[PDB]
Write a protein that binds this ligand. Structure first.
Ligand SMILES: Nc1nc2c(ncn2[C@@H]2O[C@H](COP(=O)(O)OP(=O)(O)O)[C@@H](O)[C@H]2O)c(=O)[nH]1
Ligand SMILES: [Mg+2]
Length: 244
């Protein structure tokens, strides 16, 4: 479908997205496919709707047995495909049936970028997070991690008491990255080489805006263009995409 949501982005965001997608088109990539994975309730669907700028997937405090969905939008000969998914944990365990459904849904498809999504405003990683990584590695292979971005939602979180945002967020992202390294079995150099970048998101209607009317992080940066910059970076990193 035509990309109506694009028209609703502020000019400053439009400008950046055109630059990013324009770079892909120059390399004769006239489309890209983004897979989104995560536990339930972390804002996967919300982040998808933020990226498309339309209500294309269902958001809810409760996890609906639901199926993967591909949302596709096209503009000036360029097409973005984003695959939203059911959560990867159920009742304190990894949901392997969800993973198999997702994998089944991906047959024949080429995945340019994985977004592995979790919340910023969480105080610990636990064994379940590592098991989610382990299961993703078993389903798609170790190589998925060289095409992945860690996306942390609820970025407008303000930590309690004396704690700085920067200390809290660097600890949260570090702990997750170390979990990815552990669950993927990657050696320290191998892991450094995968170069997994951390991107922040705030899907709340109450998100701060910068002075160009763009949804902004506490540092003032426009987060939707940041995330698109990171996606298009990974899409064109010349590591091989993920075929299933
Ligand atoms: N404050 C805030 N709430 C969010 C954010 N992302 C999602 N939510 C809320 O968290 C709940 C789950 O969101 P959803 O997108 O359905 O998560 P999913 O199960 O991972 O697909 C919903 O009630 C959303 O409104 C975020 O960045 N900030
Ligand atoms: Mg969802």
């Amino acid at each position: 479908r035509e990309w109506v949501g694009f028209q609703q982005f502020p000019a400053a965001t439009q400008e950046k997205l055109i630059e990013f997608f324009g770079k892909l088109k120059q390399k004769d990539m006239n489309s890209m496919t983004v897979l989104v994975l995560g536990k339930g309730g972390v804002g996967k669907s919300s982040t998808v709707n933020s990226l498309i700028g339309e209500q294309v997937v269902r958001v809810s405090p409760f996890q609906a047995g639901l199926r993967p969905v591909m949302v596709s939008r096209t503009m000036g000969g360029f097409t973005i495909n984003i695959i939203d998914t059911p959560g990867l944990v159920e009742a304190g365990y990894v949901n392997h049936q969800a993973l198999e459904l997702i994998k089944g849904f991906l047959v024949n498809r080429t995945i340019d970028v994985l977004l592995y999504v979790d919340r910023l405003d969480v105080y610990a990683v636990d064994e379940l997070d590592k098991q989610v990584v382990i299961a993703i590695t078993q389903t798609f292979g170790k190589e998925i991690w060289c095409k992945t971005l860690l996306v942390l939602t609820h970025a407008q979180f303000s930590p309690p008491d004396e704690l700085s945002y920067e200390t809290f967020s660097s600890k949260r992202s570090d702990s997750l990255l170390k979990t990815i390294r552990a669950g993927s079995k990657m050696r320290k150099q191998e892991f450094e080489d995968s170069a997994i970048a951390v991107v922040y998101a705030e899907n709340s209607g109450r998100c701060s805006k910068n002075d160009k009317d763009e949804k902004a992080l506490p540092n003032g940066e426009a987060w939707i263009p940041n995330l698109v910059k990171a996606i298009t970076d990974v899409a064109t990193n010349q590591r091989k995409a993920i075929h299933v």
